[PDB]
Amino acid sequence: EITASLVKELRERTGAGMMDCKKALTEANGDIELAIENMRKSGAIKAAKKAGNVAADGVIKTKIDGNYGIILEVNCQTDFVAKDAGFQAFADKVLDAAVAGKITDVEVLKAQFEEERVALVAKIGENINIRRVAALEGDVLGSYQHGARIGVLVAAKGADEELVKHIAMHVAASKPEFIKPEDVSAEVVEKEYQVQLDIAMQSGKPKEIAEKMVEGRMKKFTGEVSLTGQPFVMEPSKTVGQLLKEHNAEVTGFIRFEVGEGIEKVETDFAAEVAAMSK
Amino acid sequence: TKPHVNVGTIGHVDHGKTTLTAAITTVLAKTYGGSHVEYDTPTRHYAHVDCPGHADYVKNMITGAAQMDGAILVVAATDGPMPQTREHILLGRQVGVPYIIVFLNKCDMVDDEELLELVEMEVRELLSQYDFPGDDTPIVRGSALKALEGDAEWEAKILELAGFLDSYIPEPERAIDKPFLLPIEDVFSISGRGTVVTGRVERGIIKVGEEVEIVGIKETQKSTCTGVEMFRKLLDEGRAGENVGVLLRGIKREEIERGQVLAKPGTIKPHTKFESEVYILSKDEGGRHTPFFKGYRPQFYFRTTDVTGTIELPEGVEMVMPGDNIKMVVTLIHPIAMDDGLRFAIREGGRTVGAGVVAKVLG
Numbered sequence: 001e002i003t004a005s006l007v008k009e010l011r012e013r014t015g016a017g018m019m020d021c022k023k024a025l026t027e028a029n030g031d032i033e034l035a036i037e038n039m040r041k042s043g044a045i046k047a048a049k050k051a052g053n054v055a056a057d058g059v060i061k062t063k064i065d066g067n068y069g070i071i072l073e074v075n076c077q078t079d080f081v082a083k084d085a086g087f088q089a090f091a092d093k094v095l096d097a098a099v100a101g102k103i104t105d106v107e108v109l110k111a112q113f114e115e116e117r118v119a120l121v122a123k124i125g126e127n128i129n130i131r132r133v134a135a136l137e138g139d140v141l142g143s144y145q146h147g148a149r150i151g152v153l154v155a156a157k158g159a160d161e162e163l164v165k166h167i168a169m170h171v172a173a174s175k176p177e178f179i180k181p182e183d184v185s186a187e188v189v190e191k192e193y194q195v196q197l198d199i200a201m202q203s204g205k206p207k208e209i210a211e212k213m214v215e216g217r218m219k220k221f222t223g224e225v226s227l228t229g230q231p232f233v234m235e236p237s238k239t240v241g242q243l244l245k246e247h248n249a250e251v252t253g254f255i256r257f258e259v260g261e262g263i264e265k266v267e268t269d270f271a272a273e274v275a276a277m278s279k
Numbered sequence: 280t281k282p283h284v285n286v287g288t289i290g291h292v293d294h295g296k297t298t299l300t301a302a303i304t305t306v307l308a309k310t311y312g313g314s315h316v317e318y319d320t321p322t323r324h325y326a327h328v329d330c331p332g333h334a335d336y337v338k339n340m341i342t343g344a345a346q347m348d349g350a351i352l353v354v355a356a357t358d359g360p361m362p363q364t365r366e367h368i369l370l371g372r373q374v375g376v377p378y379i380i381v382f383l384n385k386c387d388m389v390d391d392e393e394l395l396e397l398v399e400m401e402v403r404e405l406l407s408q409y410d411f412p413g414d415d416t417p418i419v420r421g422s423a424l425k426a427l428e429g430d431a432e433w434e435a436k437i438l439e440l441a442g443f444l445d446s447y448i449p450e451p452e453r454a455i456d457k458p459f460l461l462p463i464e465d466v467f468s469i470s471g472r473g474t475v476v477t478g479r480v481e482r483g484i485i486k487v488g489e490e491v492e493i494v495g496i497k498e499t500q501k502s503t504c505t506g507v508e509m510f511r512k513l514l515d516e517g518r519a520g521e522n523v524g525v526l527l528r529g530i531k532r533e534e535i536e537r538g539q540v541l542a543k544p545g546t547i548k549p550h551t552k553f554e555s556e557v558y559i560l561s562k563d564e565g566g567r568h569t570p571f572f573k574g575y576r577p578q579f580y581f582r583t584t585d586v587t588g589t590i591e592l593p594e595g596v597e598m599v600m601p602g603d604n605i606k607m608v609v610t611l612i613h614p615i616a617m618d619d620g621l622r623f624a625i626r627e628g629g630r631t632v633g634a635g636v637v638a639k640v641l642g
């Protein structure tokens with residue numbers, strides 16, 4: 001009783017591969033619900049086969065609920081899949097749950113969504129991975145999404161919607177790792193001082209000159225890595241700290257995620273791969 | 280010279296694009312003898328690229344990689360189309376690839392004829408959803424791997440695909456066969472002869488006696504070619520690719536300027552407003568170090584000259600960072616001769632910081 005029409009029906013419901021549908025339906029004696037169950041077990045093994053593939057594309061998503069915001073990375077292999085409605089809906093569902101549940105342990109989020117992830121992988125045929133999640137809490141929160149590839153959350157005090165947005169955009173573009181220059185620990189500043197003194201010394205600068213130049217470099221260093229010490233991207237004649245003071249505001253926190261951060265860019269040589277197969 | 284056709288493969292990572300391309304090269308070599316791959320049929324020479332990434336393809340297209348004349352959509356018949364198959368086809372529509380041919384791969388692993396037909400009907404429906412002619416699309420039922428393994432049956436299907444490359448993708452129009460156009464670089468006066476404008480003929484041919492329009496920047500003018508020369512030697516005609524001087528009847532040196540084009544009458548118009556696809560160079564590519572915003576006012580370099588323009592960013596986009604690609608609507612401060620497909624540089628202070636293509640002329 002395994003008609004083309006029955007195969008068609010199971011395929012519309014699951015989006016599963018044609019031949020996978022035929023096989024599941026045949027083993028299920030034509031019971032659609034049982035076939036879907038069968039495909040569920042099969043799917044874990046299909047996904048396991050892909051789990052080793054590098055998944056460095058995908059999306060950053062952000063969502064705010066009052067004094068609580070989540071930022072989330074969900075990866076896939078290609079940006080074609082990153083744009084797909086089904087992948088999008090999965091990432092949105094994960095996001096919604098992380099906000100609703102105030103979930104900051106990515107292994108909890110992973111566990112909750114593993115069955116859905118597997119079904120998605122089995123149908124899309126790319127490794128998909130819920131990679132990381134973080135919360136930011138704050139009096140005022142805002143977000144910025146630079147397409148799907150960069151997301152930012154900012155927490156502030158005394159700042160209106162537009163100012164928070166502009167600071168989030170700045171963070172997206174300029175990637176500070178601290179809020180203020182004085183937040184850089186003394187221990188880190190002293191290590192960076194020695195790095196710069198070694199460099200200055202071997203370039204032939206006399207000790208007394210090198211020391212004074214390096215003191216200057218440390219101010220530049222803690223300015224460059226801190227939000228308030230960076231030139232404001234929309235008006236770089238002023239720092240963000242000056243911007244905040246003009247608005248009687250402050251920033252109490254921020255988080256920036258970028259898709260594929262810390263995952264090595266795999267290079268592809270199409271011509272070579274074709275030549276390899278041409279034996 | 281044998282006609283040149285640019286093709287590309289698009290499809291799911293696992294569905295055999297690489298195997299197919301290898302099989303095309305192998306079978307065409309065995310049959311007819313002898314980054315990107317190249318192969319020949321008796322009548323055509325093909326340059327073949329892969330399209331693994333949406334942004335990557337758009338960037339390549341913008342920065343100079345010749346646009347596909349046709350795409351091969353590769354779908355394994357075991358699965359049928361994937362959810363992201365619609366994004367593959369949507370890419371095709373977005374860059375305006377003129378034709379798509381489908382290669383249904385792994386048909387050796389599908390026994391049921393009715394199942395192959397279901398897969399085929401799905402692909403046709405997807406194509407038509409994005410206004411490709413799904414009913415008339417060539418769909419080849421093949422097996423890349425078995426053809427590569429020299430199974431006669433499946434080699435024939437590779438030859439079939441090649442036949443459609445040959446028949447279904449029309450011969451791309453050569454520059455020389457296009458209506459005359461010369462981008463003007465310099466303008467000189469010659470007493471007892473008249474005005475001469477120099478440049479490299481981009482398309483077509485200019486002969487003595489023929490009318491031309493002078494298009495862009497200023498109100499269009501018409502003139503007659505009274506001579507063509509190369510290094511001070513008179514030619515009967517100037518041809519696409521040749522650096523020439525065109526002598527013009529009556530029109531005076533002050534009435535013509537760099538950035539204008541000479542063109543066959545009625546074949547190109549000046550415009551000020553257009554939709555474009557743009558790519559902004561990264562810092563490492565020698566571009567901007569910092570983002571720009573809605574008020575960015577660069578120059579748009581069309582053929583031989585800069586024209587200032589303002590920009591309208593897409594809805595929801597407030598910032599453009601080095602390395603981004605985006606769509607933008609551009610309004611120039613004066614008109615410039617242009618058609619859909621024309622490339623341009625984006626410059627500031629005379630330095631190139633990006634590239635674009637005119638997608639759609641508006642006004």
Ligand SMILES: Nc1nc2c(ncn2[C@@H]2O[C@H](COP(=O)(O)OP(=O)(O)O)[C@@H](O)[C@H]2O)c(=O)[nH]1
Pocket residue numbers: 291292293294295296297298299384385386388421422423424425
């Ligand atoms: N069974 C079968 N598999 C094929 C055929 N053509 C390609 N493939 C599959 O295609 C896969 C690799 O080709 P491709 O889709 O370009 O993937 P990639 O090389 O891993 O990036 C292999 O795992 C093959 O199983 C075919 O005719 N038959």
